[PDB]
Amino acid sequence: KLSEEQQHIIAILLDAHHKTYDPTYADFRDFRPPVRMSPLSMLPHLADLVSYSIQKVIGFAKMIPGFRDLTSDDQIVLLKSSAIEVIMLRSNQSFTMDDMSWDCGSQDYKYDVTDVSKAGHTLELIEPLIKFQVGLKKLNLHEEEHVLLMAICIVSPDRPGVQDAKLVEAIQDRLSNTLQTYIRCRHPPPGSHQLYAKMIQKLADLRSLNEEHSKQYRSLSFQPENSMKLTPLVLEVFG
């Protein structure tokens, strides 16, 4: 059975996400206009979306039970390492199977493989990304599963530079144990079969995706001209 503390946790994460994620995508107008005519024409638009998204991820993180206990340094480290992975995760909701693109309800905010390429990212990142999206979409997780995964990703003991591994591990365990218990009680066969293990595997794919992005990000970031198009937050977070 789902313990009451576990049901509580789920309620909190769902709400956290509802506040942090806007289905309407109204806020997108505020970003620099998307340009699809021209190298890295997409980047200023795309860089603003990412910067926006980083903020939304930071807000979601704070709501997570026990995240507030961690030293400020340990909070910072967890956000810096996971922010790309979470953005990729949350981005699933916009991602459409039919067209293989991220659909933001409007033709102008629809995002395709060429758009991401127009950001200054090679197919090696891109092609694994699309594959991840498909593979995630196929799981067809409940909303409770989706929020829970993001929170378990955000709070990782392994992340480089962590001051207090043991305490971060304790907090993650509670959420993991909440997710396991939820699938068995709340998720029916045959969709329930292998779902925790499959979901865990997706965190591993994200780790690989994080490493690739980072290399690509540095070569992009290294050039002063491209670096000027990034937001201040993005520079600070992504380094």
């Binding site: 903020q55 930071i58 807000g59 993180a61 704070k62 910072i76 201040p232 600070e236 977070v237």
Partner: peptide, 10 residues
């Protein structure tokens, strides 16, 4: 070092 993150985390 990091300022913007610290402010947002509170």
């Amino acid at each position: 070092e990091n300022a913007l993150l610290r402010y947002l985390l509170d």
